[PDB]
Amino acid sequence: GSHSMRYFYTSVSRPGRGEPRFIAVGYVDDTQFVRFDSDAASQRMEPRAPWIEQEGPEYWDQETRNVKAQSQTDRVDLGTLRGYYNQSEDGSHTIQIMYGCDVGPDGRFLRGYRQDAYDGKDYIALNEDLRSWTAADMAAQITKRKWEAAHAAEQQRAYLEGRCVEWLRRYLENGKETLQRTDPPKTHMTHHPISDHEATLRCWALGFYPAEITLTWQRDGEDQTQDTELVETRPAGDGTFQKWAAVVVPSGEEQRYTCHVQHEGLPKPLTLRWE
Amino acid sequence: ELFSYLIEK
């Protein structure tokens, strides 16, 4: 299977309540491995996965320095963007940053990404070719010129195709017993009469890793995606995931419906029918 | 490992 490393930064201004809230989290696939919280007592990058704990003091000192540098950059950028948008000093504002690299099963680079938001809206993003920026408005356009003058795209591309891919490969090897495991979904179907003439069929997938799964309902063989209740894939809290899909069917016509489960851990896609 | 080439907006 193909893998990703992703970092997520949230900065929220707190006017009259001291410094902005800064939260940084690192992921390999759907597993968090590092965190930083400005409001925590440590003021250190902290491990959140067992396999990162074996990184030495130099790693933790480096990631702490660099994450603090990012928090300081965000503190400045909150002030700058407040200026760009002619906003008052008494309102809370949010900067969000996401970046990361994807590698195929062979461990080779597939793609990289860098995206920035202001108050939950696109601000600036690195293009697919990793050579140029797309600015959302005139404010972001001023940023784009500053980033072009710093040759930021060259450095982002260098990171995403170099250190990002190299460290992801290292993490994948060190944590392979969890990160590179394939747990197939434990599947079952429940039946709950709504009335005398209708009933909900719910198709369950439990204890699966990674998070990527397809649950689909068919009526005699035809897909029913537009009449299917499909909850977001959710973490069980033990590192596995859960999902269900439901359809409301006429009573007596239950066996005309099939739930289809596709997961990497399955050697054969499953077809479930009420028994 | 974090990205470290930080340019202000």
């Epitope: 540098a69 300081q72 950059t73 450095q155 250190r163 | 080439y5 340019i7």
Partner: T-cell receptor, first 111, second 113 residues
Framework: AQEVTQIPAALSVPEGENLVLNCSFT??????LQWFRQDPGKGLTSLLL?????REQTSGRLNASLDKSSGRSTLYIAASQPGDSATYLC??????????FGGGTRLMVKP | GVTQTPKFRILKIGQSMTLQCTQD?????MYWYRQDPGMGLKLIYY???????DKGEVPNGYNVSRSTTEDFPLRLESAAPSQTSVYFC?????????????FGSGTRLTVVE
């Protein structure tokens, strides 16, 4: 962390002769590298500033190079003159450590 | 550019003093370094804007404040022999400082018994 080193710490050379001053740094992820001149009891003068993307910079008889793959920078001085005699400081700027200085090399160009 | 005072000062062991450092360039980033004889500059304290300060490499025995963009004073509360040094203040428009840092002329401090 960022540790900048300049070995040797002192150099003596006859005037007219070409010389190399050495700089090494442990963290190759940098904004830019700077070579300074310092006269006794005085402040800093920026001689050259090499950007992370740039491979060398030149100002007359001064030439500085950059190799991030080995984490090294050398300052070349052509046709050395007694007036070149000073302390030369190597400094590397990055996000984590900011402008970080080596111990310096005391150059004495012998007339 | 960057103005720091005084140029020179003799302190008795235990005496306090404040080194002033001012810039009118609206620079967010300000820095304090010290330099011992035959050594490089070492970062004491830095500030990324008004109302925040952060420890550098060698913060021990010093205090700083950044009430305003303009000023970054360095405080010695109790002069010790080890604080005999040359102190350089600096500023920059950005962390990357593509033009390099703007450095003050320096302050020579001599602590005596």
């Amino acid at each position: 962390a960022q540790e900048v080193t300049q070995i040797p710490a002192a150099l003596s050379v006859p005037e007219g002769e070409n010389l190399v001053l050495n700089c090494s740094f442990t963290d190759s992820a940098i904004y830019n590298l700077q070579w300074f001149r310092q006269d006794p009891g005085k402040g800093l003068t920026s001689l050259l500033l090499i950007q992370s993307s740039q491979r060398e910079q030149t100002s007359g008889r001064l030439n500085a190079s950059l190799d991030k793959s080995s984490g090294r920078s050398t300052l070349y001085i052509a046709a050395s003159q007694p007036g070149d005699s000073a302390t030369y400081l190597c400094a590397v700027n990055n996000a984590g450590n900011m402008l970080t200085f080596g111990g310096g090399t005391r150059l004495m160009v012998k007339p | 550019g960057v103005t720091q005072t005084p140029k020179f000062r003799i302190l008795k062991i235990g005496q306090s003093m404040t080194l002033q450092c001012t810039q009118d360039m609206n620079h967010n980033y300000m820095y304090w370094y010290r330099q011992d004889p035959g050594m490089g500059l070492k970062l004491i304290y830095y500030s990324v804007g008004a109302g925040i300060t952060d420890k550098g490499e060698v913060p021990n025995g010093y205090n700083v404040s950044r009430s305003t963009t303009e000023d970054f004073p360095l405080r010695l509360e109790s002069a010790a022999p080890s604080q005999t040094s040359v102190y350089f203040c600096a500023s920059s428009e950005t962390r990357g400082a593509p033009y390099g840092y703007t450095f003050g002329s320096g302050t020579r401090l001599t602590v005596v018994e």
